[PDB]
Ligand SMILES: *[C@@H]1O[C@H](CO)[C@@H](O)[C@H](O)[C@H]1NC(C)=O
Ligand SMILES: [Ca+2]
């Protein structure tokens with residue numbers, strides 16, 4: 001709560017969970033980033049840049065690749081199609 | 084009473100999931116509410132409601148000494164009878 | 166070949182360039198027309214954002230953002246608001262005549278807005294199978310206006326439009342069971358006759 005406060009007051013603070021020995025819980029595959037963007041490019045998204053210029057947000061997201069597809073992380077090669 | 088799926092967008096409210104965390108945005112009405120994985124609640128609220136709102140999250144002036152304006156309109160010191 | 170014209174006839178209907186009315190009620194933000202399609206370098210990207218408009222009512226105010234020449238001019242609440250001026254300001258041109266905001270953006274692009282709901286982007290021969298979106302591709306063929314983002318035709322328009330949403334994590338609008346009596350004309354046959 002102290003971190004989330006100081007971020008809202010206009011000072012984001014990084015890497016405080018590396019040694020704190022308390023990882024905030026998140027589902028399988030994703031781990032707690034700090035300051036991730038809300039418009040994470042997923043597997044069935046349009047490549048539409050310089051539009052999601054919202055504030056940076058705390059939360060958990062997939063690894064560097066490993067895009068999102070219906071509440072899990074999967075590598076971009078295994079992206080499905082939709083019909 | 085009817086259980087509905089998610090996402091959901093009715094009536095100016097977008098019930099979504101951002102960054103693993105559930106979100107309920109009401110930017111037309113002027114609020115954003117999200118719950119995290121541990122169950123902790125959070126409410127972001129616009130400056131339109133400055134010293135206007137009151138409730139369990141108090142009012143939105145700057146002073147913290149007067150966040151206990153009861154529903155009767157009086158101050159308090161015990162957090163509970165508030 | 167003449168100039169073509171999209172349209173947003175009412176709250177939830179769209180008339181393609183080649184001419185195709187279809188029903189798509191949505192509440193997310195959608196690509197109405199863009200030149201960034203396939204192997205094109207591309208120049209512009211027009212979007213349309215509705216809110217509370219899955220059910221047509223005195224709700225459903227539309228917002229429109231248009232992205233051209235590095236610009237960002239958007240509009241809602243009966244007014245036009247620039248957010249980022251574009252480089253070649255010479256082609257930018259606004260005409261506030263009558264019930265409408267006419268809005269010129271180039272030799273072959275234009276927008277016409279009645280300040281409430283109707284969006285009529287006008288294009289010329291210059292493009293001619295270089296665009297795509299909810300308005301189609303402007304090629305003369307009317308049967309291929311439902312080619313989605315994933316490069317196939319759908320038989321159902323409600324699955325076509327959800328291909329063109331801008332945020333992948335907002336809601337997919339639901340398949341409504343097809344009825345001639347939409348919402349309030351359903352049980353009241355008189356109000357279905359007074360409306361006719
Ligand atoms: C906040 O609103 C109340 C309404 O009665 C007013 O009395 C008070 O002075 C306001 N405080 C400020 C300075 O905004
Ligand atoms: Ca206070």
Ligand SMILES: [Ca+2]
Pocket residue numbers: 183301302303304305306307308309310
């Ligand atoms: Ca066509």
